[PDB]
């Protein structure tokens, strides 16, 4: 019942080829040849590009093509162009007669250097504490391509309660920014030795820590 | 050209009900099945429901089964989504989507060939409520303002009444488990200016006639 599995992020240079994967089980992708792909540019409706594993509607460039093998479907884009930059979604018909969408993949057409994020971790201000609330703010800035995942550590244990992360959007300087919030009580904040914001970008991880001092 | 026009989305309390419409033209409406698909802002697509071209059986995602009801009125080229027992996690943009294959009784062959621009449904139990603004205190430095617990959208944030624009970034709002919005606005500045230069964020929340100015300082 969870989304079909897709890579978070995939990127290539103009001219290159990339393939996105979509992995299900014998309950959907493995049994049925009714896998479709959709393209969605930011703030726009999705647009169909591939149906029934391999077929292409009229109007869709044939640089796009699809295949399947076992529990994995694949979309392949060749001769990568700037306009191909978008999110890509697969979807599979299931044995329950439902349609199951994958988690999506951000496809970046590389037009600038890879840039690791700068992370600044803000403890709750004193004013917020006076108001009986505590929010840790994790500011993530200057990264390319625009995809990260954020993890919060309390002292040394994982925490995902009261976390809220925005999705990367462009900054004025043309790189990406994102933010994550950890809400908790002043008791929680004062009790632990530390809290940590962990940001993962292109297989790399940068970490910031704050302590009530 | 195929046209799909959704409407009816808006704010509704948890446990409440709301009914979306999709009016369609540019194809023979009665020969195709229709779908509803949803997307929480900046998240992935999630298939909601399908109604076949001619009465038979409607299919639903497990997450909406028993609460949601799809249907159609061919006489007006309209598909409906009746949403009852709304939960906060139902907040999403709802798209209406034509099924590609003619005369099909399952959302099967062909995928979804055309989609509308969508309608936004916000599931919160909250009313007009002004933000509380807290400072995020700072060779470069990051400083900012946390704009907390307001409803509904939007706020707007300037720095120093507009004179400061370089290195500014106002994030998108997050809807919290409380049914309220929070955003941050940030400026990256020269460390060497922290003592001398004054940084004030101006937070405007039109829905409540609230403006807040907050000088943010080191330490």
A41, B29, B33, B155 from B56: Cα distances, Å: 35, 16, 11, 47
The answer to whether the CB of A186 falls within 8 A of the CB of A132 is yes
Q: ω into residue B152 within 30 of 0, thus cis?
A: yes
Q: Could you give the CA distance from residue B105 to residue B33 in angstroms, rounded to a whole number?
A: 7
Map tokens 């001619």 to a residue: B54
In angstroms, the separation between the Cα of residue B111 and the nearest Cα of chain A is: 6
A130, A186, B136, B216 from A127: Cα distances, Å: 5, 12, 10, 12
Q: What is the DSSP string of B24-84?
A: EESS-GGGEEEEEEEE-TTS--EEEEEE-SSSS--EE-TTTBTTEEEEEEGGGTEEEEEE-
| Burial class for B78, CB neighbours closer than 10 Å (0-12, 13-18, 19+) | middle
Q: Are B155 and B217 in the same domain?
A: yes
Q: Are B97 and B170 in the same domain?
A: no
Q: Which residues of B touch A164 (CB under 8 A)?
A: 174, 176, 182
Q: Of B91, B109, B125, which closes a domain?
A: B125
Indicate which CATH number applies to the domain containing B175. 2.60.40.10
Q: Are B28 and B90 in the same domain?
A: yes
Q: Which residue of A has its CA nearest to B35?
A: A99
Q: Are B116 and B215 in the same domain?
A: no
The answer to whether the CB of A193 falls within 8 A of the CB of A212 is no
The answer to whether the CB of B44 falls within 8 A of the CB of A104 is yes
Strands A72-77 and A86-93: unpaired
> What is the domain count for chain B?
2
Q: Which two tokens stand for residue A138?
A: 């994790």
Q: Which residues of B touch A213 (CB under 8 A)?
A: none
The answer to whether the CB of B80 falls within 8 A of the CB of B35 is no
Q: Are B102 and B155 in the same domain?
A: no
Q: Are B110 and B132 in the same domain?
A: no
Say whether B45 and A91 touch across the interface (CB within 8 A). Answer: yes
Q: Dmax over Cα atoms in chain A, in whole Å?
A: 63
Question: Does any CB of chain B come closer than 8 Å to the CB of residue A172?
Answer: yes
The answer to whether the CB of B115 falls within 8 A of the CB of B3 is no
Q: What is the CA radius of gyration of chain A?
A: 21
Terminal C-alpha separation, chain B: 60
Q: Are B108 and B137 in the same domain?
A: no
Say whether A99 and B60 touch across the interface (CB within 8 A). Answer: no
User: Same CATH fold, A112-212 and A1-111?
Assistant: yes
Q: Which residues of A touch B35 (CB under 8 A)?
A: 99
Q: Are B16 and B84 in the same domain?
A: yes
Q: Which of B61, B108, B97 lies closest to A34, judged by CA?
A: B108
Q: Which residues of B touch A52 (CB under 8 A)?
A: 109-111
Say whether B118 and A45 touch across the interface (CB within 8 A). Answer: yes
| Burial class for A169, CB neighbours closer than 10 Å (0-12, 13-18, 19+) | middle
Q: Where are the domains of chain A?
A: 1-111, 112-212
Q: Which of residues 172-191 of B touch A (CB under 8 A)?
A: 172, 174, 176-177, 182, 184, 186, 188
Q: Quote the domain boundaries for residue B46.
A: 1-125
CATH of domain A1-111: 2.60.40.10
The answer to whether the CB of A139 falls within 8 A of the CB of A179 is yes
Q: Which of residues 100-159 of A touch B (CB under 8 A)?
A: 100-104, 118, 120, 122, 125, 127-128, 131, 133, 135, 137, 139, 141
Q: Could you give the CA distance from residue B137 to residue B157 in angstroms, rounded to a whole number?
A: 17
- The DSSP call for residue B10 is -
- The DSSP call for residue A51 is B
Q: Which of B119, B123, B176, B127 lies closest to B15, judged by CA?
A: B123
What is residue B198's three-state secondary structure? coil
Q: Are B182 and B139 in the same domain?
A: yes
A40, A73, A77, A79, A108 from A16: Cα distances, Å: 20, 20, 8, 5, 12
Q: Which residues of B touch A51 (CB under 8 A)?
A: 100, 109-111, 113
Backbone angles phi, psi at B206, to 5 degrees: -50, -45
Q: Which two tokens stand for residue B210?
A: 């609230």
Q: Which residue of B has its CA nearest to A46?
A: B115
Q: Are B72 and B111 in the same domain?
A: yes
Q: Which of residues 36-55 of B touch A (CB under 8 A)?
A: 37, 42-47, 50
Q: Which residue of B has its CA nearest to A170?
A: B169
B20, B61, B125, B162 from B47: Cα distances, Å: 15, 7, 25, 43
Q: Which of B147, B142, B200, B183 lies closest to A140, judged by CA?
A: B142
The answer to whether the CB of B143 falls within 8 A of the CB of B186 is yes
Map tokens 């920014």 to a residue: A177
Map tokens 């990568």 to a residue: A80
Q: B215 forms bridges with which residues in the sheet?
A: B200
Q: Are B134 and B113 in the same domain?
A: no
Q: A22 forms bridges with which residues in the sheet?
A: A73
Count Cβ–Cβ pairs < 8 Å, chain A vs chain B. 143
Q: Are B140 and B100 in the same domain?
A: no
CATH of domain A112-212: 2.60.40.10
The dihedral formed by the CA atoms of A13, A14, A15 and A21, expressed in degrees to the nearest 10? 60
């Amino acid at each position: 019942q969870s989304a079909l599995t897709q890579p978070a992020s995939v990127s290539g240079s103009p001219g290159q080829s990339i393939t996105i994967s979509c992995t299900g089980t014998t309950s959907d992708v493995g049994t049925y040849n009714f896998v479709s792909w959709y393209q969605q540019h930011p703030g726009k409706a999705p647009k169909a590009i591939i149906f029934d594993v391999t077929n292409r509607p009229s109007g869709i460039s044939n640089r796009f093509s699809g295949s399947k093998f076992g529990n994995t479907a694949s979309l392949t884009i060749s001769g990568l162009q700037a306009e191909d930059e978008a999110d890509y979604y697969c979807a599979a018909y299931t044995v329950a007669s439902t349609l199951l969408f994958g988690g999506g993949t951000k496809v970046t057409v590389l037009r600038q250097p890879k840039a690791a994020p700068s992370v600044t971790l803000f403890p709750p201000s004193s004013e917020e504490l006076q108001a009986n609330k505590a929010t840790l703010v994790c500011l993530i800035s200057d990264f390319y391509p625009g995809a990260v995942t954020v993890a919060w550590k309390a002292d040394s244990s994982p925490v995902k309660a009261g976390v809220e992360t925005t999705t990367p959007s462009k900054q004025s300087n043309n790189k990406y920014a994102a933010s994550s919030y950890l809400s908790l009580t002043p008791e929680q904040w004062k009790s632990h030795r530390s809290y940590s914001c962990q940001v993962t970008h292109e297989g790399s991880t940068v970490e910031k820590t704050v302590a009530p001092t | 050209e195929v046209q799909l026009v959704e409407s009816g989305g808006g704010v509704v309390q948890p446990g409440g009900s709301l009914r979306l419409s999709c009016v369609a033209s540019g194809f023979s409406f009665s020969d195709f099945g229709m779908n509803w698909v949803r997307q929480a802002p900046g998240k992935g697509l999630e298939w909601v429901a399908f109604v076949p071209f001619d009465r038979r059986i409607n299919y639903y995602a497990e997450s909406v089964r028993g609460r949601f009801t799809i249907s159609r009125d061919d006489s007006k080229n309209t598909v409906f989504l009746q949403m009852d027992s709304l939960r906060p996690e139902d907040t999403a943009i709802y798209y209406c989507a034509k099924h590609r294959s003619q005369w099909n009784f399952w959302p099967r062959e062909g995928g979804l060939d055309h989609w509308g621009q969508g309608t936004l449904v916000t599931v919160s139990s909250a009313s007009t409520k002004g933000p509380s603004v807290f400072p995020l205190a700072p060779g470069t430095a990051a400083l900012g303002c946390l704009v907390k617990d307001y409803f509904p959208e939007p706020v707007t944030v300037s720095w120093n009444s507009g004179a400061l624009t370089s290195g500014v970034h106002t994030f998108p709002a997050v809807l919290q488990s409380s049914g309220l919005y929070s955003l941050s606005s940030v400026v990256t500045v020269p460390s060497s200016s922290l003592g001398t230069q004054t940084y004030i964020c101006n937070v405007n929340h039109k829905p409540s006639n609230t403006k807040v100015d907050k000088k943010v300082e080191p330490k």
